[PDB]
Amino acid sequence: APLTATVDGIIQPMLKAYRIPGMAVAVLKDGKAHYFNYGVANRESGQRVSEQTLFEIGSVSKTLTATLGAYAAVKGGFELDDKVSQHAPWLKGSAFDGVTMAELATYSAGGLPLQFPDEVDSNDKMQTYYRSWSPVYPAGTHRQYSNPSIGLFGHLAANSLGQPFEQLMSQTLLPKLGLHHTYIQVPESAMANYAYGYSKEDKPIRATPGVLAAEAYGIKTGSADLLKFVEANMGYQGDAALKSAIALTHTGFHSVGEMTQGLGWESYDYPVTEQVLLAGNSPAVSFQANPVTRFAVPKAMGEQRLYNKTGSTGGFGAYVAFVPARGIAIVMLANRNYPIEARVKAAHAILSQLAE
C-alpha cells in the first residue's frame, strides 16, 4: 500500500503527540472517497470514531455560511456590491452605509473584531453594537478575520430571502447539497453520533451557544458528509442556482500575501509549499488586521488552486483542503483543539502524496 499506510504514518504520531482521543479523516482521490478512522468519539463510553461520527467543525462552518450567502445572491436577495444597510433597515445611517455585503463576507468592512465584545450577547445588543460601531479602517482595505463580520453576512443573506438562517440552512441548502447527516442543532435522533470534545484539562465539552453562532461556527458533521460538500466544490452538477453559488465561493476578492480570500474558502496558487500554507493559516494572518492587496474586480480563482479552511471549538479541531485540478481533497475532524500548524503539516503531507 501507499494510501492506508500514507495516512496512518502521518496521522497516528500526531494523535499521540497531541493526545487526540479521536479523529475522522476522509480523502478524495480518482473520483473516490476513502475513510480512515482513529480512536474514540467518547472517552467515557469508548464509542469509536467512524465517518458517521458528528464533530464540531468550528469555523469550517463559514464555508457553508458562505455558500448560503452566495445562494441568496444568485436567487436575487442581494448583490455582493450592495451596501450592507440596503439589506438591514436598522443599519441605515451607520458605518454600514459604506460597507458592501462582499466586504462583510470577506472580513474587510474595516476592523470588525474577531469576537463580539462579551456583553454583546443578545439580538438587541447586537443591533446596537453594529449601529454604533466605529470603523478602524476604510472599507475594503484591511482584512481582519471576524465572526461578527461573516456572522452578519450570513444573517442578512438569509433575511434577504425571508427566512431565518437556520431554516434556510437546514430546509434548503443542506438538502440540496445532499448533506442529510449535517446539523446546526443536532436532533435527538442523531445524538448517539455526537462526539464529545476534550479541553486541555481532558474534560468533555461541547460548543458554547451564542449570537450568530450558527453562522460563524455552528455546524456539526462527520467526515463523509463534509467530503461530500468538498466533492460539490470539485465539480457539482444539477441545481443551476447551487452550481452558481458554489462558483461564487471560488471568487477571490482580495489577497493577503499568497492567500486569496474568497467567500468562506481561502486559497493558494497550486502547487503550494508547506511554508506558504502555514504562513497563510498562521496568527500573522488570522489574529491581526492586515492590509490587503486589492483586486480591480473580483476574479474567479479557478481549478489550479488549493482551497482550504481551518475550524476549531473549545474541544474540536478541523481542517479541509482540496485541489480541483488534481482531483484530491482531505478532511480531518478531531475532538481536541490541537494546533493548526500540525493540521496543515499533516494535510500537506498527505495531499503531496495523493498528487502522486
Which residue carries 481582519 as its cell? 144
Cβ nearer to Zn ion, comparing 172 with 260: 172
Q: If we measure between CA atoms, which residue out of 297, 300, 179 comes closest to residue 244?
A: 300
Residue 160 annotated in active site? no
- Structural contact between residues 296 and 158, judged by C-beta atoms closer than 8 angstroms: no
Residue 254 is labelled as binding a ligand: no
Q: Which three cell numbers stand for residue 308?
A: 482550504
Q: What are the E-state strand segments in 191-240?
A: 197-198, 204-205, 220-221
Question: Which one-letter amino acid corresponds to residue 89?
Answer: P
Which C-beta is closer to Zn ion: that of 76 or that of 175? 175
Closer residue to Zn ion in complex, CB, 44/118: 118
Q: What is d(CA 54, CA 88) in angstroms, rounded to the nearest whole number?
A: 34
119 is an annotated ligand-binding site residue: yes
Q: Which is nearer to Zn ion, 83 or 143 (CB)?
A: 83
To Zn ion, the closest distance from the beta carbon of 305 in angstroms equals 25
CB of 162 to Zn ion, least distance (A): 12
201 is in an annotated binding site: no
Q: Tell the smallest beta-carbon distance from residue 121 to Zn ion (Å).
A: 4
Interaction site with Zn ion (CB under 5 A): 34, 119, 121, 175, 180
Q: How far is the CB of 154 from Zn ion (least distance, A)?
A: 11
Nearest one of 212, 249, 232, 290 to 105, comparing CA atoms: 249
The burial class, CB within 10 Å (0-12 / 13-18 / 19+), for 240 is exposed
- The number of CA neighbours under 13 Å toward the Cβ of 65 is 33
Q: Which of the residues 50, 59, 189, 267 is marked catalytic?
A: 59
Q: In angstroms, rounded to a whole number, what is the distance separating the alpha carbons of residues 274 and 45?
A: 37
Number of other residues whose CB lies within 10 A of the CB of residue 102: 24
Cell readout for 272 is 503550494
Minimum CB separation of residue 180 from Zn ion in Å reads 4
Minimum separation from the CB atom of position 167 to Zn ion (A): 13
Cell numbers representing residue 52 in the block: 458517521
How many CB atoms sit inside 10 A of residue 9's CB? 13
Choose between 34 and 326: whose C-beta lies nearer to Zn ion.
34
Residue of minimal Cβ distance to Zn ion? 34
Residues 311 and 217 sit within 8 Å (Cβ to Cβ): yes
Specify the residue, 79 or 121, whose C-beta has the smaller distance to Zn ion. 121
Q: Is 250 annotated as a binding residue?
A: yes
Burial of 186 (0-12, 13-18, 19+ CB in 10 A): middle
Residue 142 marked in a binding site: yes
Judge whether 181 is annotated as a binding position: no
Which residue spans within 227-315 are E strands per DSSP? 251-256, 259-261, 266-269, 290-291, 293-300, 305-313
Catalytic residues: 59
Binding site listing: 34, 119, 121, 142, 155, 180, 215, 250, 303, 356
